Design a protein that fits this description.
The protein is mainly beta. It folds into two domains: 1-133 and 230-485, Neuraminidase (6 Propeller), CATH 2.120.10; 134-229, Intramolecular Trans-sialidase, Domain 3 (Intramolecular trans-sialidase, domain 3, Beta Barrel), CATH 2.40.220.10. The chain is built from one helix and 35 strands. It starts with 16 loop residues before the first strand and ends with a helix. The protein binds ligand 3XR.
């Protein structure tokens, strides 16, 4: 029979809505997953969103209680039905910080799991982020900048330095203030507190009000004593015990270009290179409104340092979400969304440092604004060939008609970026052409089965906002997918 949720309204997240699936089988056989826990309807930031996470230790069949490894506490986490009328549907939480659009990655060499998300200061999301990195240089060293509450609004005369100590940069001296690994604020070693906000509707009016509950004050919150520059940040935590415990929060977007408005994640999974001289490199897809649209961050030292790469010179700031697969020789093929009405592919022969021009992919119909996709390597040959799988909608209007494709890789006899071709030989229909189908993430489960976590609705449509239980999990055998329609 069926019968298919990981995250759902009423689970331990206390969220009624979810979006932006991520699904990843670990080298051990454990399977994990993540998604946005979108409390305030299915809206993008600005809102209140935490990153949810869950684990399966029976091969991706039974899923435990979800956890929230990236969370903010300025607004309460609760189950609330967001109005779906013509006016209220548009209403968003105004004053909350958020984590949005997750990426999971495993370093198989060290058995470390990384979870990434975009990290949005209170009231911010991509569309209203300010231009700039949010970091300053003090004596040539990058530090997160901070604005003190009694300084002028545009003045950021403070910085977070070693051990979370907050410095006054006009005198170069340590203050009595610091932040811990959540970026919560301390004064002379004592937790700073503020009241939590609640949210409730009265008709179509959204009331954001302080409660009596004290939470930690945090530099990402709307009226904290010190506050960050209001732009998009990239956050990461790692786990050496498959998500039992997590590290302190790393803000890894030190490299955010000063000309950029936002620089954010391509949701899904990252990749570790298996073959060739960059074997072991970890790479994570990004996009921006900047000098470049498509970009990546990579680490040659198992996660300690990250280098930013621009993949193009597009200043359009389209939603160029990408996912990455590896060819047998270790070169990379990236498949990305664009704002141009096709999925595009770009190639790299130097482990992701440089990339070819976009090739429009014509097997798949998509919309003008586009939809995220998922692409993965498969570990067993298919029809005697190395294979990749792609999941995406397939429709010119609307997010619908989801397919899983299988691509078979051949050496063309040519050189470099032209060395392989892919034959999209198979195409499996997940439901039917009229049924909603948006974001998705594939994984290869330990039994060679394919797992899929996906949005079973049109998450772009202003008429399908704020639907519950649309995030759906299914498993397939490879034979089932080998369809030729
Ligand atoms: C960070 C952010 O706002 N990301 C959003 N970008 C638009 C996407 C889409 O469905 O096209 C998602 O809404 C995504 O969360």
């Amino acid at each position: 029979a069926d019968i298919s949720n990981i995250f759902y309204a009423g689970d331990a997240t206390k969220s009624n809505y979810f979006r932006i699936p991520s699904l990843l089988a670990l080298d051990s056989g454990t399977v994990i997953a993540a998604a946005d826990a979108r409390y305030g309807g299915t809206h993008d930031a600005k809102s209140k969103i935490n990153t949810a996470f869950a684990k399966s230790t029976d091969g991706g069949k039974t899923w435990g209680q979800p956890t929230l490894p990236l969370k903010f506490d300025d607004y309460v986490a609760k189950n609330i039905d967001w109005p779906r009328d013509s006016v209220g549907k548009n209403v968003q939480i105004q004053g909350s910080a958020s984590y949005i659009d997750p990426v999971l990655l495993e370093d198989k060499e060290t058995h470390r799991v990384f979870l990434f998300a975009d990290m949005m200061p209170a009231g911010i999301g991509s569309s209203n982020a300010s231009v700039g990195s949010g970091f300053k240089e003090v004596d040539g060293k990058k530090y997160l900048k901070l604005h003190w509450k009694d300084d002028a609004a545009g003045t950021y005369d403070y910085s977070v330095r070693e051990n979370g100590t907050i410095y006054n940069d006009t005198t170069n001296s340590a203050t009595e203030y610091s932040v811990d690994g959540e970026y919560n604020l301390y004064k002379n070693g004592n937790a700073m507190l503020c009241k939590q906000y609640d949210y409730n509707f009265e008709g179509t009016k959204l009331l954001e009000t302080q409660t009596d509950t004290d939470v930690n004050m945090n530099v990402f919150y709307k009226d904290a004593d010190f506050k960050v520059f209001p732009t998009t940040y990239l956050a990461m935590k790692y786990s050496d015990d498959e998500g039992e415990t997590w590290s302190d929060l790393q803000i890894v977007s030190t490299f955010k270009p000063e000309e950029s408005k936002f620089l954010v994640l391509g949701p899904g999974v990252g990749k570790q290179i298996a073959n060739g001289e960059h074997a072991g490199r970890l790479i994570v897809p990004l996009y921006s409104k900047s000098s470049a649209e498509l970009g990546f961050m990579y680490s040659d030292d198992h996660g300690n340092n990250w280098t930013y790469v621009e993949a193009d010179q597009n200043t359009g700031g389209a939603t160029a979400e990408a996912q990455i697969v590896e060819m047998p020789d270790g070169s990379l093929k990236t498949y990305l969304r664009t704002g141009s009405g096709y999925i595009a592919q770009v190639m790299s022969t130097d482990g992701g440092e440089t990339w070819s021009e976009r090739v429009p992919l014509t097997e798949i119909a998509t919309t003008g604004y586009g939809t995220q996709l998922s692409v993965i390597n498969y570990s067993q040959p298919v029809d005697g060939k190395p294979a990749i799988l792609l999941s995406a909608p397939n429709a010119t209007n609307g997010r619908k008609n989801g397919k899983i494709w299988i691509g078979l890789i051949s050496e063309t006899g040519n050189s470099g970026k032209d060395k392989y071709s892919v034959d999209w030989k198979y195409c499996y229909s997940v439901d039917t052409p009229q049924m909603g189908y948006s974001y998705s993430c594939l994984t290869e489960l330990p039994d060679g089965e394919i797992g899929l976590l996906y949005e079973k609705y049109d998450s772009w449509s202003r008429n399908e906002l704020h639907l519950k239980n649309i995030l759906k999990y299914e498993r397939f055998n490879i034979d089932e997918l080998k369809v030729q329609p």
